[PDB]
Amino acid sequence: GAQVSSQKVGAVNYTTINYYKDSASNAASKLDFSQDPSKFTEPVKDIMIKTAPALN
Amino acid sequence: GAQVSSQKVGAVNYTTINYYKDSASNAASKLDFSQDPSKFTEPVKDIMIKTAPALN
Amino acid sequence: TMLGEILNYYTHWTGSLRFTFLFCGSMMATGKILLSYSPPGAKPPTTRKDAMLGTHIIWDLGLQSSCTMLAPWISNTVYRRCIKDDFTEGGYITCFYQTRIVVPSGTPTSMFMLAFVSACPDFSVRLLRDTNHISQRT
Amino acid sequence: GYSDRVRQITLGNSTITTQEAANAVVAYGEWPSYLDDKEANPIDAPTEPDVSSNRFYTLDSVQWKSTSRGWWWKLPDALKDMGMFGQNMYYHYLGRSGYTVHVQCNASKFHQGALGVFAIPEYVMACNTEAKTSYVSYVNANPGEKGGVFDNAYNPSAEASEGRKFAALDYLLGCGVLAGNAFVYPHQIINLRTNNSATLVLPYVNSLAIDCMAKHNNWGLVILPLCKLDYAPNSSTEIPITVTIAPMFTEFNGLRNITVPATQ
Amino acid sequence: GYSDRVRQITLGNSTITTQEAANAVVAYGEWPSYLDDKEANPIDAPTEPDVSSNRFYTLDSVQWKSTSRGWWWKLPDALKDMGMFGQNMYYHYLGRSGYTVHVQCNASKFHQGALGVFAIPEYVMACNTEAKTSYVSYVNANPGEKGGVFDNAYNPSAEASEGRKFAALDYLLGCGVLAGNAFVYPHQIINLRTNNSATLVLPYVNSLAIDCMAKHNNWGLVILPLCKLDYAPNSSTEIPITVTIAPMFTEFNGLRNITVPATQ
Amino acid sequence: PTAQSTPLTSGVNSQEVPALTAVETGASGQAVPSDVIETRHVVNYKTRSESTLESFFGRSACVTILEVENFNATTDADRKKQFTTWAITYTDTVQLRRKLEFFTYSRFDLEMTFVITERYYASNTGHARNQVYQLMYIPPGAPRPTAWDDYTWQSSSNPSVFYTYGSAPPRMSIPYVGIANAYSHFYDGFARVPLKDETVDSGDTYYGLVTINDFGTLAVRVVNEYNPARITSKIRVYMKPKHVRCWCPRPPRAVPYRGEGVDFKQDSITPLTAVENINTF
Amino acid sequence: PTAQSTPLTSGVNSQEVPALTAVETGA
């Protein structure tokens, strides 16, 4: 049950096998590049178009 | 994700598996026999043919 | 600032910085204001005629309350250091009256604006480190 | 959402906003452009400095008072000491340029007054001695960013040597024509109740494709108070007028050592 | 008809001819070029002055004597006061440039001598006090078009304040390596019996796409007499060496007010 | 790929003259033996494997020796012996430095290895329990310790390695961390432009890479509290560049270094030993 | 996924005014 994944590039793959029956034992979660800044930077009810006036 | 490669001959293959998620952790780069001495030994604009006069 | 606090957990930063200004005078106050970013290596600007030679925006006060000036990413190195450092100096941000603030009678003649900073989507940080902003006795 | 009153102009590293504009003028309906091969004259590959020089330069501000008679500048003269535009201008024998002119003057809903803002091709003005004709010094003709002012009186000099400046008489537009007819030139009006800025986009205008910028101003910029500034709580109040101008589609020929004009 | 000895180079409004060349060097086999989008860093639209700045500038000449130990310049330092190149350099925070370097030295069929002409990336030189390390003033590091000279003696200063200049010791190439190995750098030789000029075309070389020209010289230019000048009728004769350099593919970012470096 | 084999050639009598050239061009001599002698065929099976950059640099080299101690410190000077800080560099030693300085620019990941040794300071003060060491990498900006047991050693974000005396030499990899697209081994410039008429000091400013380089600090302590027996330790730091690229070759250092710069020393600028005569075999 | 690339843009003279906003909105 080996997982082969891309490495973070340096100056290209690596292999992982989980040895333990509890997921808590696992190494770090894989890089998660998810983001949605707008839930904090623009949490407005009505859409604001940049090129338009903010208030009309 | 095992890589099998030729060994450097002695007086014929070996196996590598990367264990880490960062390429910086990897062992030495594979032998790179690339070369282009002419960028230092002959960096001239106009081609020089050995058998010809260097200056004509 | 929130950006500053996050930056102090990292060693390197890159990208554009957004400066947004909110005018908080009365509705009857008008004005034009110059906001400038001068990349480094020259006399720091202390007059409008030097400031206006750099990256700048002329903000007209009005119904739209806020104006955004960008410090676009303009750097020799690909990252700057999250410390005071001559080599990775970032330049100079200044602000001048372009005309002046004008008010009619019965109106406050002094007032304020608020300045905000945030990172743009081209912005990223590297090299996790401990901050100098928290400590304890031992 | 979009409005004739709200505009953004970006050139190079510079941006202007206004929230109380009144449309914008494109002089003679023609946007500036580079010089086409079929209209070209000097044959050397031109320098086209683009963003280094084609950007907004803000001049020193002037003060509008109830007694002001008006202001004038010439172009490219007013920008001759402006950053890389000035350098490109003076390192070359020849240059051409269009402009975005943005005149700025805000007040309040309780102030009143109206400025005529005119762009005048070949703005030739009268001299101030009647002992000679066309008798104006280079230095007085080319004041740079400070420009000049109009007067409501004409007082020509007793001696010719003392009158080598413009007789900038307001109602004759400094040139023997009635100011009420200046509207035949590309213009806007800043009427304080309506707008706080004027924007004029100017193509290159000349009888030649390209010319000597240090010898010849292509445009005059005139700002005349058509209706005087008034403000009831203080009739002696002053409000700034700020002039910001960007060269556009600049093109230069005949590179050599730098031109350094006489200063006195 | 065509010959390795006869060459014309035209850049902008300037042309060089030579009738006794010896081919030309393109450093590291790479012609200069503009900065590609996939390698770019600062995001503002760059200024690319093209013909205004990418042209041959001739420095003050130096005199080769039988006793001369050699000459050095740094680049872009040597061209910092050269026409529009200098203006574009100092009005911007960032700049990059390649170069055509043309070194000129003619004599006669009866003179003899040989000059090594080397282009050295990051030509860091030793300081002249042993009380400190890396202790060189900005002014002494950046002499401009006059460049500097090598010496055959090393005499470090008694006090640190007096030794803030380069110890340009010829046989150690002013930097602790043997001069006989300078041929690992892009080079030509002007050997008077063979040729009267050297031509080196240099790409931009740095660990960055673009950098601060006023802080950092990318190349050193070194001219060392490998075999001394000799002329039988007059061993004290002198012949000029003239250095002419054209920036190429110049590109600048981060426009603001002009940089005026300290002069003392 | 192998080094060049030699072809079978005889003699010539020809207008082709490969023996002559003109090095004024900037080209090195190019002729090979077959051009100027009669040669047999020799098949060359030998390779340049050990002179690739990876092979040339493929060694862990000692770059510094640090010292730390563990004892009951009652003075400021002795308190400062309980930990050490070192600005990370390759200029404390000469061997790796000289090899790197064959090149102007480089790009590589780093393997760092450490060798830690101890001795008793004295024999009349009993013994000492086995010691654990902390080696903390402090990137530029992170707070530096002023005592061996201050808050900085909690190292929430800085990488630290805890090493137990007698265990295998500790080791970690570091990526290429340069803020430029390569490391510069030489920098012909300054960190800022001094401007006309400014009041900033120009008399005590420096030049070159020292004005711009900063790879942070290594801080080392013994984690244990003091025993009656004072223990003194050395930490040898080793660097191996790996995954190496280099650009722009340079003549190698010919005379002794005297610091972090390219400066040379007046009593040590005569590397050649004079020969008796130009005709000395 | 990468941080944002910068597009090639020139200037404008337009009723589109992205430089102005109103942070009273909470944006």
Ligand SMILES: CC(=O)N[C@H]1[C@H]([C@H](O)[C@H](O)CO)O[C@@](O)(C(=O)O)C[C@@H]1O
């Ligand atoms: C570093 C060093 O030299 N240590 C030596 C000490 C100290 O000199 C004294 O104990 C200090 O007073 O003396 C010894 O005789 C000892 O204690 O057995 C030998 C030991 O090697």
Ligand SMILES: [Ca+2]
């Ligand atoms: Ca908007």
Ligand SMILES: [Ca+2]
């Ligand atoms: Ca030949």
Ligand SMILES: [Ca+2]
């Ligand atoms: Ca151009």
Ligand SMILES: [Ca+2]
């Ligand atoms: Ca043969």
Ligand SMILES: [Ca+2]
């Ligand atoms: Ca301890």
Ligand SMILES: [Cl-]
């Ligand atoms: Cl002026």
Ligand SMILES: [Cl-]
């Ligand atoms: Cl100079």
Ligand SMILES: [Cl-]
């Ligand atoms: Cl702890």
Ligand SMILES: [Cl-]
């Ligand atoms: Cl303990």
Ligand SMILES: [Cl-]
């Ligand atoms: Cl001998």
Ligand code: NA
């Ligand atoms: Na072979």
